């Protein structure tokens, strides 16, 4: 159904996107649990090319998180 | 089966009917029927015009009660001024200026009934500020078009200004027959009445209103001319050596010069001496 | 001239004026890509293969 | 009981063409009939109109006829295409009023419960005043004074109706009567104000005078009630211009350099522009 | 007279207006808006209104029933 229209979107986000062609310093950054199902237009490198991964507590920063919090 | 550039006297308060009537019964397009008499073949006058409720069956002839219509007659002859039925109005929001195939059928039945019984059709939601719509045709039978067509008859008036709608065109109303011009009972002790006493403002020109909203308003306008310093500063650069006109045509952007022009300065230089004025004159008259 | 754009009336829907290209702005990008540059000269190490 | 009444722009022209179509041969001066509108906020508003005929005699004020039922069945017929349209009071023209108007009141205020009276002068154009509101008060005269009718005028101001710009717009189309032309405009806003202040307040001046000469009655305990505090209101103190020397000159003094100024300038623009554009022309010509 | 003319001109309604976006100022004195609903239609652009706040895809102001760029 409406999985057509969301691609239609993404589509226009990719077409301001490559509209923005580092014209001014602005930044772009989308945080995702699974970059699997993303579309490729904006996986392609020339659009997005970084690809962080923020892992779990990482045990020794997990304490030092509690530490921070606490 | 004479019908030359014919004219209707509407009156300002059979107007406000229509208006009034459109405005309470928007979306039901209700109807009503136009009062007039044909003192003669083209010169009709129209005095005054009634509201009547639309029935649920919709466009009808029955929804037009007959005894309620004659009751009302009869009080009109009672109290007020007699006059005779040959015509009828309704609020059209569907579209312009044409008639709906019920409308042309009960238009018909008019037209059995009266001589002419003129189709008006009145949009009450496309007047909105200036352009208010009233346009008459008649119907007209197979036989008039066998013969010479268009019954617009030999004169140069009704050419005037006729511009019939598209939709109305390709209806056979506005198309049969002709379209009426419309005139308007501007006779004296009436419009010299409405004049004077409706659009009232007399005593309100001696207003001071100093600063009660205008030390922030100056602020605003110190601010928007500000604006206009840069504007008319952009130009000034711009002002190229190669027929600046040239360079307006493709480079407009509406400065102080160009489109926000000294017409703009003259309101707010209006503005403030009017405030000067009311307030020098009433400080003179403070004694 | 096909593949244009044109302007039409309310009823009838007469042509007005054949307007500039509106389908080519809107939707040029896709899946797809025009002529880009990348000459040759930026190709480097291949030369045995181009 | 009700605040204060607004009229229409609606029901004005119509009153007035109502006199004239049955003054054809009811040459009594008197046109009686009933003003149906609305009163929903202590603000009551009249959106429909209806004239009888209707005769007097000066004989005690006291010999008249009207048509009950047909007016009766014209309410039925209004309230039935209108629903929210009802009676708000009865209308009469010939601004001397008479005396029949209390048993015209006695009669009608079955209708409405705060009977009104309104006179429409279809000639007269005094000023601008195109009709009068009237309500009917015989709770005592006042404190110490004996019994009467005393019918007081309730404040009435002509009010804006929705839709009906269109039409007075195209009627008129030749006066304009808007701030078009602002500076000349407001110039002839401030003249027949003026008009209209000289003409006012010297009707009160004769006011004062004819009491004085007490050849009328005297009704002070409302007239100085009313005027004295007009009179005695301080706005003749300069000294608050003194406090406020400045009480805009300085915004006087900007719009001089910078409305005067820039209209000098631009006008200097476009001279020199054209000055220049002159010249070349002649040099460049042949 | 041709100052009240003038003046009598410029009424354009000067009422609530509504909003359909607008596409992109093809010309002077015609453009192209879209309405909410889509229903993009061509229009005609007044002058009172330009450049100097008609970006290309930016939220516009149109009249109620004449949807004109105001």
Redesign the interface.
């Given at each position: 159904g409406a999985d057509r229209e969301v691609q239609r979107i993404l589509?226009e986000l990719?077409?301001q996107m490559?509209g923005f062609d580092q014209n001014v310093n602005v930044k772009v950054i989308m945080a995702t649990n699974r970059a699997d199902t993303l579309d490729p237009?904006l996986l392609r490198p020339g659009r997005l090319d970084r690809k962080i991964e923020f892992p779990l507590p990482d045990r020794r920063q997990k304490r030092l998180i509690f530490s921070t919090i606490t | 089966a004479v019908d030359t550039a014919e004219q209707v006297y509407i009156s300002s308060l059979a107007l406000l009917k229509m208006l009034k009537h459109g405005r309470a019964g928007v979306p039901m397009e209700v109807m009503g029927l136009m009062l007039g008499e044909f003192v003669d073949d083209y010169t009709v006058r129209v005095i005054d015009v009634f509201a009547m409720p639309q029935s649920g069956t919709g466009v009808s002839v029955e929804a037009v009660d007959p005894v309620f219509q004659a009751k009302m007659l009869d009080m009109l002859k009672q109290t007020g001024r007699p006059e005779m039925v040959v015509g009828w109005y309704h609020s059209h929001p569907g579209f312009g200026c044409w008639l709906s195939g019920v409308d042309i059928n009960t238009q018909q039945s008019f037209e059995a009934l009266s001589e002419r019984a003129v189709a008006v059709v009145v949009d009450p939601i496309q007047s909105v500020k200036g352009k208010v719509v009233i346009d008459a045709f008649r119907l007209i039978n197979a036989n008039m078009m066998v013969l010479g067509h268009e019954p617009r008859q030999t004169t140069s008036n009704l050419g005037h200004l006729n511009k019939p709608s598209i939709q109305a065109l390709i209806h056979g109303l506005n198309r049969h027959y002709y379209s009426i011009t419309i005139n308007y009972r501007k006779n004296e002790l009436e419009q010299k009445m409405l004049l004077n006493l409706h659009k009232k403002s007399w005593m309100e020109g001696l207003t001071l209103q100093d600063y009660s909203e205008h030390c922030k308003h100056n602020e605003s306008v110190v601010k928007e001319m500000l604006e206009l310093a840069k504007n008319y500063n952009k130009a000034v650069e711009e002002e190229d050596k190669m027929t600046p006109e040239q360079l307006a045509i493709k480079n407009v952007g509406k400065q102080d010069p160009k489109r926000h022009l000294e017409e703009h300065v003259d309101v707010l230089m209006t503005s403030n001496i009017v405030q000067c004025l009311a307030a020098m004159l009433d400080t003179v008259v403070f004694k | 001239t096909p593949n244009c754009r044109v302007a039409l009336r309310n009823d009838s829907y007469t042509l007005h004026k054949i307007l500039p290209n509106k389908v080519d702005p809107l939707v040029?990008?896709?899946?797809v890509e025009k002529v880009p540059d990348s000459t040759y000269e930026m190709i480097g190490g291949l030369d045995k293969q181009i | 009981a009700v605040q204060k009444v607004v009229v229409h722009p609606l029901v004005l022209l119509s009153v007035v063409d109502h006199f004239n179509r049955i003054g054809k041969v009811g040459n009594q001066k008197r046109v009686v009939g009933v003003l149906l509108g609305s009163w929903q906020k202590k603000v009551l508003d009249v959106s429909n109109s209806f004239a009888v005929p209707f005769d007097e005699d000066d004989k005690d004020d006291s010999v008249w006829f009207l048509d009950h039922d047909y007016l009766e069945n014209m309410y039925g017929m209004f309230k039935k295409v209108n629903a929210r349209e009802r009676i708000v009071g009865w209308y009469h023209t010939g601004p001397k009023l008479h005396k029949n108007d209390i048993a015209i009141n006695e009669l009608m205020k079955r209708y409405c419960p705060n009977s009104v009276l309104v006179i429409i002068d279809v000639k007269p154009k005094d000023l601008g005043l195109p009709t009068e509101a009237y309500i009917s008060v015989e709770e005592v005269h006042d404190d110490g004074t004996p019994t009467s009718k005393t019918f007081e005028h309730v404040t009435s101001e002509i009010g804006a109706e929705e839709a009906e710009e269109v039409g007075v717009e195209h009627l008129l189309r030749d006066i304009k009567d808007t701030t078009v032309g602002t500076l000349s405009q407001r110039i002839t806003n401030q003249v027949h104000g003026l008009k209209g202040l000289n003409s006012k307040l010297l009707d009160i001046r004769s006011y004062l005078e004819k009491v004085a000469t007490g050849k009328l009655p005297i009704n002070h305990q409302i007239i100085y009630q009313l005027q004295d505090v007009f009179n005695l209101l301080p706005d003749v103190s300069l000294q608050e211009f003194v406090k406020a020397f400045y009480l805009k000159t300085n915004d006087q003094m900007v719009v001089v350099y910078l409305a005067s100024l820039i209209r000098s300038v631009v006008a200097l623009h476009n001279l020199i522009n054209n000055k220049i554009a002159n010249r070349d022309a002649e040099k460049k010509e042949g | 007279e041709f100052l009240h003319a003038q003046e009598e001109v410029k009424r354009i309604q000067s009422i609530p207006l509504v909003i359909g976006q607008f596409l992109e100022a093809v010309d002077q004195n015609t453009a192209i808006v879209g309405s909410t609903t889509g229903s993009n239609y061509y229009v005609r652009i007044l002058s009172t209104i330009d450049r100097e706040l008609l970006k290309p895809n930016a939220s516009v102001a149109l009249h109620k029933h004449s949807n004109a760029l105001v």
């Open positions: 589509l990719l077409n490559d237009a | - | 040029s990008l896709m899946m | - | -």
